[PDB]
Write a protein that binds this ligand. Structure first.
Ligand SMILES: C=CCNc1nc(N)c(C(=O)c2ccncc2)s1
Length: 290
């Protein structure tokens, strides 16, 4: 904008570009997202202005929404690093379990809050989980699909997409976020993406190959879904101890519940917080190189 100075470009999206900026007047440093077009749909600006009220310590604060000259600016509190970068930097050593558990616990708290207020993220990924030096981790760049929908030179990653979305479900439930967070949990533990699909069908088949091709037994209604094909190959579920070694049984149990095929059987964020895995949760600080 004009009340700001683009320190640097910190991100790219199909929607818009993200900049680290400094408020010429208040001096506060923020992340600024710029978006495209002929009048900007209002049904969007309303679901957006509503997110300005969704305040929680584990949700990146949306400071302002500014619609001007066919441009939409979202001003957010700035964090210094995202989990994707932190994982790459911790890849040789691995994030210590206590920190993984603390991050998973905080993210479930952020989701429990969003979900209790009927708001879904829809596009959780390491790149939009932001961390600070205080040991906090926060949810950012909400999918605002209910605000806009589902999305140059920016291929959308499908690695964290819940199976019901890939199968063409018309209505997303809060379970899509739990699925995405389970995939992230597995990735933090193993230091490798759980289901790195490079196309929608490849994404779906990688999930099937690991968790077994779903059927009416484990997911009632699955065979009636829009993109379900009877011709899908039938893979047997793989031994789950092979999925996230060396994660302990409490962690494996919780992950397995976050990855249930049936959105109705999938654990909620609130129930996940009560899982035995968090009996010894603590809040360590990460070592950050900024
Ligand atoms: C991760 C380091 C840069 N600092 C950031 N800080 C914040 N708050 C960021 C975002 O809210 C964000 C917006 C749109 N897409 C992705 C992230 S990015």
């Amino acid at each position: 904008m004009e009340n700001f100075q683009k320190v640097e470009k910190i991100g790219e999206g199909t929607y818009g570009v993200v900049y680290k900026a400094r408020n010429k007047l208040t001096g506060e440093v923020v992340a600024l997202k710029k978006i495209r077009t002929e009048g900007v749909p209002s049904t969007a600006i309303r679901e957006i202005s509503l997110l300005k009220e969704l305040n929680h310590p584990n949700i990146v604060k949306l400071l302002d929404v500014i619609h001007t000259e066919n441009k939409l600016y979202l001003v957010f509190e700035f964090l210094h690093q995202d989990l994707k970068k932190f994982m790459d930097a911790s890849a040789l050593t691995g994030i210590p379990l206590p920190l993984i558990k603390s991050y998973l616990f905080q993210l479930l708290q952020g989701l429990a809050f969003c979900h209790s207020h009927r708001v879904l993220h829809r596009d959780l990924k390491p790149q939009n989980l932001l961390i600070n030096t205080e040991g906090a981790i926060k949810l950012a760049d909400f999918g605002l699909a209910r605000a806009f929908g589902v999305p140059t030179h920016e291929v959308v990653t499908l690695w964290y997409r819940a199976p019901e979305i890939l199968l063409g479900c018309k209505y997303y439930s809060t379970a899509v976020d739990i699925w995405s967070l389970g995939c992230i949990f597995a990735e933090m533990v193993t230091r490798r993406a759980l289901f790195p699909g490079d196309s929608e069908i490849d994404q779906l088949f990688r999930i099937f190959r690991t968790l077994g091709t779903p059927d009416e037994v484990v997911w009632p209604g699955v065979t009636s879904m829009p993109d379900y094909k009877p011709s899908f190959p039938k893979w047997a579920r793989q031994d789950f101890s092979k999925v996230v070694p060396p994660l302990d049984e409490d962690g494996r149990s919780l992950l397995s519940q976050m990855l249930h095929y049936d959105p109705n059987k999938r654990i909620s964020a609130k129930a996940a917080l009560a899982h035995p895995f968090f009996q010894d949760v603590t809040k360590p600080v990460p070592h950050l190189r900024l």
